[PDB]
């Protein structure tokens, strides 16, 4: 997955958006295109909107979600 020495991978622009949202505890979704960013304990509780390929789907970061990448909660293929 990722070498522990390199630490988590967290993209700079989502990082900036999430800290600027944490100082306010705002509830409006953070619409984001990067589904490769690590979910950290800091962003537990608020809501992002992760691109699934076609549109953005909301993802309310729960407690049992740190340790997963953002794109895991945004399915890309829609099969019935």
């Amino acid at each position: 997955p990722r070498s522990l020495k390199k630490g988590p991978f967290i993209d700079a622009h989502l990082f900036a958006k999430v800290e600027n949202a944490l100082e306010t505890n705002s509830r409006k979704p953070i619409k984001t295109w990067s589904r490769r960013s690590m979910i950290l304990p800091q962003m537990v509780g608020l809501t992002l909107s992760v691109h699934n390929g076609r549109t953005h789907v909301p993802v309310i970061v729960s407690e049992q979600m740190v340790g997963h990448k953002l794109g895991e909660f945004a399915p890309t293929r829609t099969y019935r």
């Binding site: 390199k6 630490g7 991978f9 700079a12």
Partner: protein
């Protein structure tokens, strides 16, 4: 191949050439056992902040004449097809048909 793709490959290799040395020094900095943890982490952040194409991984070497992605040979720098034509014409030194 398309002229657009050929020029894309040229301009993509351009940043690799421009940042070849910075990447070397920065990689040494991050791999330095002696370097401080925060120093190495900041260097890693800078590396990830470097432009997209600067990495030599997005480079895909291609035939000089036709720009063919595939059937490429590192020794000759040519695709399989143009390599065959030049070899059979004899323009490729040392290269001949193989039967052993």
């Amino acid at each position: 191949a398309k002229k657009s793709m050929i020029n894309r490959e040229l301009k993509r290799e351009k940043e690799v050439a421009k940042y070849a040395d910075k990447r070397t020094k920065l990689k040494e900095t991050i791999s330095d056992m002696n370097a401080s943890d925060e120093v190495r982490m900041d260097a890693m952040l800078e590396l990830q902040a470097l432009p997209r194409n600067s990495s030599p991984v997005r480079l895909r070497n291609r035939c000089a004449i036709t720009g063919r992605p595939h059937g490429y040979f590192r020794k000759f720098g040519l695709s399989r097809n143009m390599l065959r034509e030049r070899v059979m014409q004899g323009d490729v030194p040392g290269v001949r048909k193989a039967s052993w």
